[PDB]
Amino acid sequence: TPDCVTGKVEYTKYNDDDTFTVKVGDKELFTNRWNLQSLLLSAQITGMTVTIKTNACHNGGGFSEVIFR
Amino acid sequence: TPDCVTGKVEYTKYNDDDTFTVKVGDKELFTNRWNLQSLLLSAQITGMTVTIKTNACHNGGGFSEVIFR
Amino acid sequence: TPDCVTGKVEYTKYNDDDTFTVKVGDKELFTNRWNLQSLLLSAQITGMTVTIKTNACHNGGGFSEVIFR
Amino acid sequence: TPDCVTGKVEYTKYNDDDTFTVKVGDKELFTNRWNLQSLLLSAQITGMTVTIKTNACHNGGGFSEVIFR
Amino acid sequence: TPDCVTGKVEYTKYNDDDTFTVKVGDKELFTNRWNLQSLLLSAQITGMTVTIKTNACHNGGGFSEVIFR
Ligand SMILES: [Zn+2]
Ligand SMILES: [Zn+2]
Ligand SMILES: [Zn+2]
């Protein structure tokens, strides 16, 4: 799966459908993996850099693969 | 769904019906989404700023959408 | 529901019947709400002040409502 | 149940039989309560002191009761 | 179980099959124990040294035993 975007988490969002949105770089992407919610919030609080991998590399795209750096 | 209130989590409360209350700004609001319990506590402990989105923007109003900043 | 006790969590205990006990102030109280187990352990680890609300305000009393501050 | 050992959680281990072993002090003990796993992992990562209670207070003995301090 | 690698967590990756990969030393290893995900992320964040134990000590090997030092 290609790199989609790399950077700090600017904000995260819990959505009404119970998915979890992240804003990294210039993209808003969401995931439906419940386990990623607390990992992504920790990344955000402590200021880690993340790399989101997905074929759906556009606003409102979904992802399931993340690299924390 | 529109912004209701933005600020630090002043306290949280586990309720008898297994919902979870947060006080943000001058409002107490609650959510029935289990996943938000641990995120909201972490946001409180680490002192994040949250934005709660809901139309029920009054004491005792419910929400399911939150932005963590 | 009236306040019973406010303070830091001195210790917590996992019991054989899969309930969870906390000692706050001079009271040991228990909850059978699984959701509170991880929330109370976090409050203990991070040094939060908790207020336990219950009508059974005596040693060995049960509760299901907590305020985290 | 009597106190068996008090100390920090030195390490943890998922066994083939779906039980969970911890080493506290000079003892490896195991539990089959799933709920206790995540509490013990949290105790382990944050360096809490635990007291394990069991009357099979020897290597390979089981427990279902824990005090977290 | 024999030691495989000891070192700092260089990065972690959440995978599409919901497993979690860590890079320690010169090895990428993964675990299917979801409870270990937040512990491994914390290790990465705080810069702890971990020892991973497995008898599959190759890139792409699986592990379930970790020691946090
Ligand atoms: Zn791929
Ligand atoms: Zn009440
Ligand atoms: Zn007993």
Swiss-Prot record, chains A, B, C, D, E:
GO terms for molecular function: toxin activity. One of its GO terms (biological process) is symbiont-mediated modulation of host virulence. Keywords: Disulfide bond, Modulation of host virulence by virus, Secreted, Signal, Toxin, Viral exotoxin, Virulence. GO terms for cellular component: extracellular region. Disulfide bonds join C4-C57. It is found in: Secreted. Its main location: secreted. Shiga-like toxin contains a single subunit A and five copies of subunit B. There are three Gb3-binding sites in each subunit B monomer, allowing for a tighter binding to the target cell. Binding sites 1 and 2 have higher binding affinities than site 3. The B subunit is responsible for the binding of the holotoxin to specific receptors on the target cell surface, such as globotriaosylceramide (Gb3) in human intestinal microvilli. Belongs to the stxB family. This is Shiga-like toxin 1 subunit B. It comes from Bacteriophage H30. The chain holds residues 21 to 89 of 89 of the full protein.
